[PDB]
Design a protein around this nucleic acid. Structure first.
Ligand code: GTP
Ligand code: MG
Lengths: 349, 395, 69, 206, 230
RNA sequence: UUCAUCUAGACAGCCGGACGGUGGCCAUGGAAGUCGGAAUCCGCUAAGGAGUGUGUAACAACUCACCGGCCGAAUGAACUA
RNA sequence: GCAGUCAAGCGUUCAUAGCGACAUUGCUUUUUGAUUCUUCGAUGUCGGCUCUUCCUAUCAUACCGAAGCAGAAUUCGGUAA
């Protein structure tokens, strides 16, 4: 489905699937047949065994197929998200393996039953029963790796959050150690790390906040290093696809201090660098960490770099002692308001 | 119109005397690149044989090895025998004497798959074509063949580097199971220059447009015995511009085989992007080559196929039905109007590129065949392997 | 504390004679397979771990020597 | 089974020139509805068949990134394939992707729909058990009985709606499991279709 | 909860004040709980448990042998390596099938009095122009569920097995009529396509049909398993 | 029953060491024995793995395998019935 | 199921005469959850009202165990008729 798929049952590993379905056909069917009964009764006994086992496997599989979020053709944001997350290639090919196996076991049952209606002795039919069931068993025993993959993709995508692609958003991005999560935790009710190290998160964290009785979601991203778009991570391409698809205001976070362990010129280098992905967002940047430095004393090259910042159509360099929570509100209202103009100028056509 | 690489070689049809010898499974046999008689063969053991095709006797067998030798490629002067051996070491030789020259080649870690040499018209007249050996462990050691020690290994590949060539612009060509191509030069001293990332499954049998000439070592459509190295290198650059001046310039084409059927032709010199999406196989392709006159590209595979393409972009030209099995090792004629190809089974099937047909068959082993090469007058081939039979050909 | 049925341990003469017949056929089949040494020597832990091989060698220096002469 | 020189005596060899001879008429052979097939005199398919495909059989990835490197706590991969480079071309891709997702969104918005009804909560009833009168296994049994006991088959259509009363999915099975039956057609009740359509409906099906 | 929330929780607050002295004692007590489950656990849970524990002990013995071995301390080519896969017939003296098995009777008439019809019960091979004969005249019936058009046949060498279409059947021990009928009981020698194994002799045009003997009753299962005589 | 260890102190327990050259080399955002690939050296030793596991984002910290202090007599392992 | 590799251990002691568990290796139509508009001869007659009881090889209800099980809802498993 959409929006935080948590409705997928559970993918028991191949040995457990074998156990579950076979034990089930052992318990929920009669298990006493004698050589003495009518050959019709014997044929019926073993037919029912085979058909029931087939149905059981098929439902175990059909559940997975109907459950998984169907990566392709959902929404480009999520499509590329599970690309960077769970390897689109492997995803599709594993699920396809499962569909093939479902067809295979349906065929096994539908052949061996047409056979059993020609058996002539308890032993012939018992051998057919063992034969069909053993063939289904190996068919499923093949599925070691797909299922071991699917268990973890399920226990991951279930946790994975739910950001609507189209409601009012606010993206928060920049270098590690700068203050993305500081701002998020200080603005909206969430639980995101603050510890003084580089990759204080590793995936997209969300937090809602209200404004004009309306709902606005804010998204902190892990961040980006230099990484000339050749070498990246599943860490970085998430922020990439986010800043790409999601269309709202953005907050670039930099600093002039001893923390945020890069150079300011590299910071504006990355600003120019991600400027290509600042198409329809109306960026506001934040000259941050402004509590002790009083950063009005920035050198002439910083002046030139902010002159370059002031090339974009809608710009805003603004100070924020992000721990002095009495200016983070001015920042939030400022930015979202200057967004509402363009958002409504779309909505009114 | 068209060129010819002008010569006339008749359609080969004769298995000559099938020869016995050391009863093991031959893998790769190398020919004398100047005279058309001498084959060397490191079979499925440690030892190595030398024989003649025109007197059909053991030409001073090249014994004296302690572990399995794998891949034999001849030097361009007919004076050096480096041989691929799957151990960590190599031994150097010479056919004319057939004596121990020096000792091991220390340093490697696993099997030595392909051997390269210097391009001929390039390096000084009266020199030693140095070597950049490879391994299974991704290493590339550049020996000055005299010192048989290398200074700088360059390590762009982490996979098993299986293909080595030296292109005549001072260029290099290394190839590994990393699905990616990496080309270096000589003035690097531990550096990588051209990193081409195409394939999703690994590479196999990196080809060359200069392979024929720059492995013959400046010999003609008749294959004489030169005297002066300066004029020999003249002949090399001359036949060079005779064969590689298709588009007026010798832009070294690079079409590398694959698993994933992404069969891709390249031009490294002026670009990184590829050129030719000449696909169509069904199974793994192993063997490819450029025509001697560089005019087309031949691909033979594991799917009963034989393909010839446009030697100008990599456009399809022909595919040749008529097989049963995989097609392993494919060697070029001299007339360039003909082809031989070793199938998986006994037969060694022969072709007609001038009019794009099959010429005839040539069966006669009773096991699998491995090696196919060519004589330096366009006359003979030696083919031995799993059949333990080094069957010899002629027209 | 519900108690569920316990299997009977009575005879069933039909089954008892069937057992006789089954066992006899099995013995015969064994004889079919029948128609188709590392002796232990000395156990350890014995107290007289000295006198034994000494007596055997006292025997052997005679069993060997009373061949030739 | 008495020992023999057969059974280790090869049986059914065939020649280079025979393959060359009969691979040759597949792109020729003169087949019309005025000539039917009777016999086979079997010829080696796995070699005589298989025209060329120029589609690049889908690449394989299994033997190169297994599963535990793909995803899982091992996860022996960090950087993408093919690791897009051109940022402008990428934002081109992504903006056109959202807009094209909107194009499909409007396809489904225009065509449907059922979402309003399922929000009302009601649903369409059970289609009657009478609407399964031709799709019973008692029936398909006799169907295959006549398919197998027949030397040829006549698939009677009706003139007034051949395109609706064909709905074949049985000729797909016929051609492949028993090719030597040739599925004549009779367009019955023609008069209810004038001679004009009596010609139009045959002219493009013959 | 967004991501690894229980782990963020464990790092922020912790675990139950006794999650360690419970895990420890659970472990130390599992050694006792293993024997309890082995002396109780009647009736196929005991079978599953015993077979499972046998698996485990086997694996551990495998592992420790491997570790002590680790403590102690052909020749394919490049274009090939690193890739992985008397005149006596192998099977005389198969058992004999009476004419009452492999021949079932079909009484005809509402008054079952005028049978004259028989039905083969073993897997047959019918050819390529089967085209069932008229109902009034047919006396032998080999029903469509019991038919075969291919056989899974292996090779002595190459260590291979392939599914090959069955061209025709040559020798069926215990009858010539069974051979005329093409009944695939065990032991029968069928003439099967062999194109994929691709063999060429001296001159060796190419073989596309060979002989192969079946080695499993196609009734105790549905497959046909045959082996080739090179 | 077949094997060993043991007052030149056996087993179980506490307590102590479990080290330098050396964050061995690759791979990367970090991988300091413990995500991962390639061997596994020497030194001084009583021992100490280029490390059994818990653990950290990264070392720490704990541990084991391995030695020694305390104690002061059998204990260990594998099979057969 | 068939064709093999193992090889635990067994076999006048016999691994290389022999066996031989658990494991394993081979397709029986393809790799991107594509469809499925392909159902194949039951030789003996099947299927239903009223009613009672028993089994557990448990679908629900009771109580527990393990699951990334936050909540909610499940999945698997134990006692249980
Ligand atoms: N004093 C002060 N420090 C700030 C301010 N803003 C940011 N910082 C610094 O930035 C740190 C915030 O760290 P995070 O918010 O986690 O930055 P991050 O590591 O990039 O966060 P993630 O991207 O989610 O991993 C704080 O600990 C401060 O040291 C500010 O306004 N005042
Ligand atoms: Mg931080």
């Amino acid at each position: 489905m959409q929006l935080s798929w948590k409705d997928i049952p559970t993918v028991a590993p191949a040995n457990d699937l074998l156990d579950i379905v076979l034990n089930r056909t052992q318990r929920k069917t009669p298990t006493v047949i004698r050589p003495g009964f009518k050959i019709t009764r014997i044929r019926a006994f073993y037919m029912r065994k085979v058909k029931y086992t087939g149905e059981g496997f098929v439902e175990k599989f059909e559940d997975i197929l109907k459950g998984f979020p169907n990566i392709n053709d959902v929404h480009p944001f999520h499509r590329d998200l599970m690309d960077t997350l769970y390897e689109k290639n492997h995803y599709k090919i594993s699920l396809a393996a499962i569909s093939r196996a479902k067809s295979l076991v349906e065929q096994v049952a539908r052949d061996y039953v047409r056979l059993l209606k020609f058996g002539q002795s308890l032993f012939q039919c018992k051998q057919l029963k063992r034969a069909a069931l053993g063939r289904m068993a190996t068919i499923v025993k093949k599925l070691r790796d797909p299922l071991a993959y699917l268990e973890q993709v399920r226990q991951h995508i279930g946790r994975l959050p739910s950001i609507d692609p189209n409601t009012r958003t606010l993206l928060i991005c920049g270098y590690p150690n700068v203050g993305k999560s500081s701002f998020l935790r200080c603005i909206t009710k969430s639980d995101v790390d603050v510890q003084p190290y580089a990759f204080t998160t590793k995936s997209l964290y969300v937090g809602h906040f209200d404004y004009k009785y309306l709902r606005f979601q804010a998204i902190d991203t892990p961040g980006i290093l230099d990484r000339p778009t050749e070498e990246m991570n599943n860490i970085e391409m998430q922020s990439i696809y986010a800043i790409a698809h999601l269309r709202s205001c953005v907050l670039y976070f930099m600093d002039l201090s001893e923390q945020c362990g890069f150079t300011i010129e590299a910071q504006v280098k990355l600003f120019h660098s991600i400027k290509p992905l600042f198409a329809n967002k109306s960026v506001m940047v934040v000259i941050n960490k402004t509590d002790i430095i009083r950063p009005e004393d920035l050198d002439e090259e910083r002046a030139q770099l902010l002159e370059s910042v002031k090339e974009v159509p809608g710009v805003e360099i603004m100070t924020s002692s992000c721990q002095l929570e009495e200016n983070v509100m001015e920042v939030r209202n400022k930015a979202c308001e200057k967004l509402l103009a363009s958002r409504i100028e779309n909505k009114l056509k | 119109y068209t060129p010819r690489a002008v010569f006339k070689v008749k359609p080969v049809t004769r298995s000559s005397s099938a020869i016995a010898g050391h009863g093991s499974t031959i893998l790769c046999s190398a020919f004398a690149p100047h005279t058309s008689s001498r084959m060397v063969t490191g079979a499925g053991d440690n030892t190595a044989r030398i024989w003649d095709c025109d007197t059909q006797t053991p030409m001073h067998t090249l014994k004296g090895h302690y572990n399995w030798v794998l891949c034999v490629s001849w030097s361009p002067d007919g004076e050096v025998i480096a041989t691929g051996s799957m151990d960590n070491t190599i031994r150097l030789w010479d056919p004319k004497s057939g004596q121990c020259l020096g000792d091991a080649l220390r340093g490697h870690s696993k099997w030595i798959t392909s051997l390269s040499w210097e391009p001929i018209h390039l390096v000084k007249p009266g020199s030693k074509p140095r070597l950049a050996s490879s391994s299974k462990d991704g290493t590339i050691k550049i020996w000055d063949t005299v010192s048989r020690v290398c200074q700088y290994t360059m390590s762009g590949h982490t996979n098993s580097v299986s293909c080595v060539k030296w292109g005549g612009q001072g260029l290099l060509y290394s190839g590994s199971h990393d699905r990616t191509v990496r080309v270096w030069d000589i003035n690097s001293q531990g550096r990588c220059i051209n990193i081409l990332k195409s394939h999703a499954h690994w590479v196999n049998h990196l080809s060359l447009s200069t392979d024929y000439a720059l492995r013959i070592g400046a010999f003609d459509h008749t294959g004489k015995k030169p005297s002066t190295p300066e004029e020999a290198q003249k002949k090399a650059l001359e036949n060079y511009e005779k064969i590689c001046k298709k588009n007026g310039n010798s832009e070294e084409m690079m079409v590398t085989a694959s698993d994933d059927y992404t069969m891709f032709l390249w031009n490294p010199l002026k670009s990184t992007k590829p050129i030719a999406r000449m696909t169509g196989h069904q199974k793994l392709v192993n063997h490819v080559a450029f025509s001697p006159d560089g005019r087309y590209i031949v691909s033979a595979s594991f799917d009963n196929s034989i393909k010839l393409w446009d030697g100008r972009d990599g456009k399809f030209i022909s595919t040749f039905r008529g097989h049963v099995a995989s097609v392993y090792q494919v060697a070029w004629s001299s007339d360039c109007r003909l082809l031989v190809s070793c199938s998986k089974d006994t037969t060694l099937k022969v072709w007609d590129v001038r009019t794009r047909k099959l010429s005839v068959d040539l069966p006669g082993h009773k096991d699998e065949v491995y090696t196919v090469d060519w004589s330096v007058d366009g006359k003979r081939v030696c083919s031995g392997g799993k059949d333990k039979m080094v069957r010899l050909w002629t027209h | 504390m519900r108690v569920r049925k316990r299997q009977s341990r009575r005879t069933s003469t039909k089954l008892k004679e069937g057992i006789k017949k089954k066992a006899s056929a099995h013995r015969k089949k064994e004889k079919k397979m029948a128609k188709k040494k590392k002796d232990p020597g000395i156990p350890s832990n014995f107290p007289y771990k000295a006198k034994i091989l000494e007596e055997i060698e006292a025997k052997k220096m005679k069993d060997l020597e009373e061949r030739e002469l | 089974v008495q020992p023999d020189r057969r059974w280790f005596g090869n049986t059914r060899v065939i020649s280079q020139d025979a393959l060359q001879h009969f691979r040759s008429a597949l792109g020729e052979t003169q087949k019309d509805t005025y000539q039917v097939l009777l016999r086979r005199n079997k010829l080696p398919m796995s070699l005589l068949e298989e025209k060329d495909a120029d589609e690049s059989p889908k690449a394989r990835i299994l033997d190169t990134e297994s599963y535990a490197d793909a995803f899982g706590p091992k996860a022996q991969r960090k950087r993408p394939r093919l690791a897009a480079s051109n940022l402008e071309d990428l934002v081109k891709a992504t903006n056109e992707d959202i807009t094209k997702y909107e194009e499909k969104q409007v396809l489904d918005a225009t065509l449907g729909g059922n979402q309003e009804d399922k929000e009302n909560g009601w649903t369409s009833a059970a289609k009657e058990a009478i609407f399964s009168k031709g799709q019973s296994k008692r029936i398909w049994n006799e169907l295959y009985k006549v398919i197998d006991s027949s030397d040829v088959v006549i698939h009677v259509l009706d003139a007034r709606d051949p395109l609706g009363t064909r709905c074949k999915s049985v000729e797909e099975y016929m051609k492949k499991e028993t090719p030597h039956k040739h599925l004549i057609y009779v367009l019955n009740k023609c008069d209810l279709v004038p001679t004009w359509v009596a010609a139009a409906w045959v002219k493009h099906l013959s | 909860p967004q991501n690894d929330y229980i782990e963020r929780h464990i790092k922020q607050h912790g675990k139950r004040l006794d999650h360690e002295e419970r895990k420890r004692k659970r472990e130390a007590r599992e050694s006792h709980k293993i024997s309890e489950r082995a002396q109780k656990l009647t009736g196929w849970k005991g079978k599953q448990f015993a077979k499972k524990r046998y698996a485990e002990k086997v694996s551990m013995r495998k592992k420790i042998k491997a570790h002590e071995q680790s403590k102690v301390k052909d020749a394919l080519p490049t274009y090939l390596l690193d890739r992985e896969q008397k005149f006596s017939v192998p099977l005389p003296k198969v058992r004999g099938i009476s004419e009452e098995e492999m021949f079932k009777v079909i009484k005809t008439g509402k008054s079952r009095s005028k049978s004259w019809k028989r039905m083969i019960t073993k897997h047959t091979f019918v050819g390529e122009g089967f085209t069932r004969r008229p109902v009034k005249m047919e006396r032998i019936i080999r029903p469509s569920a019991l038919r075969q058009k291919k056989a899974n046949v292996t090779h002595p060498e190459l260590g291979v097995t392939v599914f090959l279409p069955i061209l025709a059947v040559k020798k069926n021990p215990q009858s010539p009529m069974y051979t005329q009928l093409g009944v695939l009981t065990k032991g029968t020698i069928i003439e099967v396509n062999v194109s994929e194994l691709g063999m060429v002799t001296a001159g060796g045009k190419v073989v596309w049909g060979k002989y192969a003997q079946v080695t499993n009753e196609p009734d105790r299962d549905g497959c046909v398993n045959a082996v080739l005589l090179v």
